[PDB]
Each structure stands twice: as structure tokens, then as C-alpha cells.
Amino acid sequence: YGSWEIDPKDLTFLKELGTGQFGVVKYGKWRGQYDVAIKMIKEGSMSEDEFIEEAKVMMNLSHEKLVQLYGVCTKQRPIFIITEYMANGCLLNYLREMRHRFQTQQLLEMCKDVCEAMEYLESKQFLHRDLAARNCWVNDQGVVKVSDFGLSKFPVRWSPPEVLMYSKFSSKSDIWAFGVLMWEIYSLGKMPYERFTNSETAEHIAQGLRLYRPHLASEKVYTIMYSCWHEKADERPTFKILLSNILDVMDEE
Ligand SMILES: NC(=O)c1ncc(N2CCCCC2)nc1Nc1ccc(C2CCNCC2)cc1
Numbered sequence: 001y002g003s004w005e006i007d008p009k010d011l012t013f014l015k016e017l018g019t020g021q022f023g024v025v026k027y028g029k030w031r032g033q034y035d036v037a038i039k040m041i042k043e044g045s046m047s048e049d050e051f052i053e054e055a056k057v058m059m060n061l062s063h064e065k066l067v068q069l070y071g072v073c074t075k076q077r078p079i080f081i082i083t084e085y086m087a088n089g090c091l092l093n094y095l096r097e098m099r100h101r102f103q104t105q106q107l108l109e110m111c112k113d114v115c116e117a118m119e120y121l122e123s124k125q126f127l128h129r130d131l132a133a134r135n136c137w138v139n140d141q142g143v144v145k146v147s148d149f150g151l152s153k154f155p156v157r158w159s160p161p162e163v164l165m166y167s168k169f170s171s172k173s174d175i176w177a178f179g180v181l182m183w184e185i186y187s188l189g190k191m192p193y194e195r196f197t198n199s200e201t202a203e204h205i206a207q208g209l210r211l212y213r214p215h216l217a218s219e220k221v222y223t224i225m226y227s228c229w230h231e232k233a234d235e236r237p238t239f240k241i242l243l244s245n246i247l248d249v250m251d252e253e
Contacts, residue, residue, distance in 0.1 A: 004059055006030070006071035006082055011038060017089075022046055023078070027085060035085040036070060040078050051079065057150050061124060065117035067137050067147040086137035086145065094138045095189030101142065104216050105253055111182050111224075112246045113144040118178060119239035121149060122171050129169060131177040132158050133184040156198040157191070162233055164202050172233035178242070179228025186214035186221065205229075220249050 013028040023042030030036045041051070051074075058069040058081075073080035088094055091110070094101075102110075114136060121128060128135075128149040135148045160176035162168040180192050192211060193201045210229050213222040224245050230236045237245070 001055065001059075001072055001074060004055075004069075004071050005075070006073055006080070008073045008076065008080060011036070011073075011080070011082070013038065030070065030082060034070070035087070037083050037085050039081040039083070041081060043078055054081075054151060057126075061121070061126065061149065063117055063120040065113050065143070065145050066120070066149070067145045084145075085139070087140035088138035088142070090134060091136035091138055091144055092133040092184070092189050095133060095185060099188060104218075105250070106142065107185050107216065108221065108246065108250055108253065110144045110185050112243065112250065114146055114178065114181060115239055115243045115246055117146040118174060119243050121146075121174070122239045125171075126150060127169055127171065128174050128177070130155055130158070131174055132181055133189060136181070154198075157193055157201055159202075160229075160233065161206050161231060164206070168233075170233060171238070172236045175228050175236045175239065175242070178239070179225040180211065182217075182221070182225040182228075183211045183214060186217040186225075188214075188216070218249075218253075220252070224249065 010031045011028055013026045015027045017025045017027055017037065019025070022039065022045045024040045026038045026040070028036055028038050055072060062068060067086060068084040070082045070084065072082065088098065118128065118131065126149065128146065129152040130148065131146070132155060135146065137145050137147055139145065155177070156164065158177040158180045160173050163173050183192060184190065193204070196204060208231065210226065217225070224242065227237055
């Protein structure tokens with residue numbers, strides 16, 4: 001895999017971070033110096049084809065607000081995937097467990113971080129398809145970054161009506177999910193539509209129901225997230241407009 005191939009001899013394992021669909025992830029060091037997350041891909045947990053896929057995406061997209069792949073170990077089994085270390089873990093857990101670290105000013109900056117990542121993906125004509133707090137990560141500085149773009153149990157609660165009825169995915173379905181993610185952020189990690197099932201949610205949003213304004217969201221912040229849920233996809237903003245909107249509110253906060 002060219003200069004993306006890392007010598008497993010240069011890795012050292014320090015702490016276990018947990019187990020996901022594809023196996024154990026550990027925190028470690030690369031070449032004695034760099035903090036890394038090491039994903040030990042469980043054999044059979046994923047096909048060769050599925051890995052060529054993931055690798056293609058990860059070595060060809062790069063941005064300060066996307067979790068950065070550092071390399072792969074493919075000359076043995078199990079495969080290792082080595083990525084940027086996100087010391088504060090998943091954003092969803094962060095919102096629920098680390099509330100002493102942020103105020104509403106920081107909640108908005110979390111949204112701006114994600115919005116920059118998605119404006120970049122939009123500029124590359126690349127759809128995330130599962131944007132949500134569970135797929136955002138927080139580093140030691142509190143910076144939020146997006147991961148697992150295009151890796152796609154269906155994320156009904158983050159989906160617009162045209163996805164649920166027609167499988168019509170576009171930049172505008174990522175916009176919708178981004179609105180829901182801002183709702184997750186300002187609700188400090190509640191499940192969207194927390195009293196409804198998935199099936200109830202799909203019927204309700206088709207009939208025009210929308211997520212209420214979280215108490216920590218100002219009217220101006222709510223206007224931004226609400227603009228993401230226009231029933232007509234072509235009336236939803238772009239991520240570049242959203243970013244401009246968010247910066248304006250941070251300047252007024
Ligand atoms: N890129 C990364 O840094 C990273 N990638 C994947 C991943 N996963 C994948 C799914 C299985 C769970 C771990 N975890 C990662 N970092 C990570 C970092 C810190 C924690 C702490 C946070 C505080 N409380 C204790 C735990 C947990 C996880």
C-alpha cells in the first residue's frame with residue numbers, strides 16, 4: 001500500500017479502548033513518539049473487498065476535522081488500521097459524560113468543527129451517509145472530528161423524508177443529519193425523538209413533525225439546525241452556508 005504501509009514492529013500497545021463491530025481498538029505509540037489508535041480488525045469481521053473500500057476512502061480524503069488515517073498493516077492477519085488518536089473518545093459519550101468541560105460557546109464550536117469537515121466532504125462530492133454524534137470524535141484539545149464517512153440498524157432518526165421513502169441520498173440528506181447532530185449536541189446526547197420508535201419517527205417526520213428546540217440552544221442556533229430539515233431538499237442550505245451561519249452566531253455570542 002505504498003508509504004501508507006506501517007511496520008507493525010514500530011507499534012507499541014498501551015491501553016485497550018474497547019471493542020467495536022470489527023474488533024478491539026487500542027491506544028498506543030507509533031515509532032516511540034506519536035499517539036495512535038490501533039484497530040485490530042477481527043478476522044472474518046470484514047471481507048477483503050470491504051477493506052479495499054475503506055482504505056480507498058481513508059487514503060484519499062484528508063482534512064483537519066476528519067479523523068486522519070496514519071497507515072495500515074496488511075502483510076499479516078489480523079490487519080491493523082492505525083489512525084489519529086482522539087483522546088476524549090466518541091462525541092456521544094463525551095456529551096453525556098464530560099459535561100463539566102463545556103458551555104454553550106463550546107457546543108457551538110463542536111458544531112462548527114463538524115460543519116468544516118462536512119463542507120470539505122461536500123466539496124469533494126462525497127456523502128458521509130451516517131453523520132451522527134456516534135461517528136464524531138473528540139481529541140485532547142476538545143476538537144471534534146468526523147469519522148467513518150461512507151462506511152455504510154438503519155439511521156432512521158437522522159434521515160430526511162426522501163431517504164426514508166425513496167432512498168434518495170445526496171448532499172442534502174447529509175445536511176438533514178447534520179441538523180439532527182446539532183440537536184444531539186445541544187441536548188447533551190439524547191437520542192433524537194427519544195419517546196418514539198424508528199417506525200413512529202418515520203411517520204411523524206413525513207407528516208412534518210420536527211425536533212423541539214433543546215433548552216441550551218438559542219433561537220438563533222435553533223434556526224440554523226431547523227433550516228436543515230426543510231421538507232424540500234433543494235431548500236436546505238449547503239454546508240458552506242451553514243458554516244457562515246454558525247460563524248455569525250459565534251460572533252454574536
Ligand atoms: N481514533 C480513536 O482515537 C478511536 N478510534 C476508535 C475507538 N473505538 C472504536 C469502537 C470500539 C471503542 C473504541 N476509540 C478511539 N478512541 C478512544 C479514545 C479514548 C477513549 C476513552 C474516553 C474516556 N473514557 C474511557 C475511554 C475511548 C476511545
